[PDB]
DNA sequence: CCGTTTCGCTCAAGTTAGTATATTAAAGCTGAACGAGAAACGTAAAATGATATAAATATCAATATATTAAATTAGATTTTGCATAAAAAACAGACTACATAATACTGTAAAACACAACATATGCAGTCACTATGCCGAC
């Protein structure tokens, strides 16, 4: 991979990129060069979004095996199983 | 004696009957840590119980007679409780004199930055290689 995933890109599409002068670049799909976009976030994220288009259902993350996770998981279900045991008190 | 069916029971999902509180305000309860003076104890030293026997000293009744400590007065006086009042010193109630800050006003250097023509390294703009398995193709 060499670069793997990095924490800029938690935040940006697919082809898109993000210099150390805080600038943007969007990839090419022919030789893997790149060009200048702009300076904001939302803007580079916007244009590298109208260029193929948007992300999907939800997140990719497809290494080799699995890692740790920290996302939501909210239930109603859940939440009167522990509604009951208030109730007995 | 034993099996079979009805009946007493409790679990599970609808159908009704009843009563109504939150903050202020000020305590009251109780586990746990905090800080000295007096007497029962104990080893050690001083006074006393132990112990006995002929000789020395005290035990005491019954009454005369000189002696004396000391409570009982009785009058004398330091001692003790309580102010009164003025000499003497403290200290606000005045006031000008004196040295000192806040303020009144003039005199002068210079901080702080816009404005404007250049000068140019450096980040950004644009393209190819570095570095190593995908995908696609065979096994």
Redesign the pocket.
């Known amino acids: 991979m060499?670069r793997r995933r990095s924490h800029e890109r938690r935040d940006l599409p697919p082809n898109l990129y993000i210099?150390?002068?805080?600038?943007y670049c969007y990839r090419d799909p022919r030789?893997?060069?790149?060009?200048?976009l702009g300076?904001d976030r939302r803007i580079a994220i916007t244009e590298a979004i109208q260029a193929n288009i948007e992300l999907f259902s939800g997140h990719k993350h497809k290494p080799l095996t699995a890692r740790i996770n920290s996302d939501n998981s909210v239930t109603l279900h859940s939440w009167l199983d522990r509604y009951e045991k208030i109730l007995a008190s």
Do not use: L
């Open positions: 060499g210099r150390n002068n805080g600038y030789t893997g060069k790149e060009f200048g300076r």
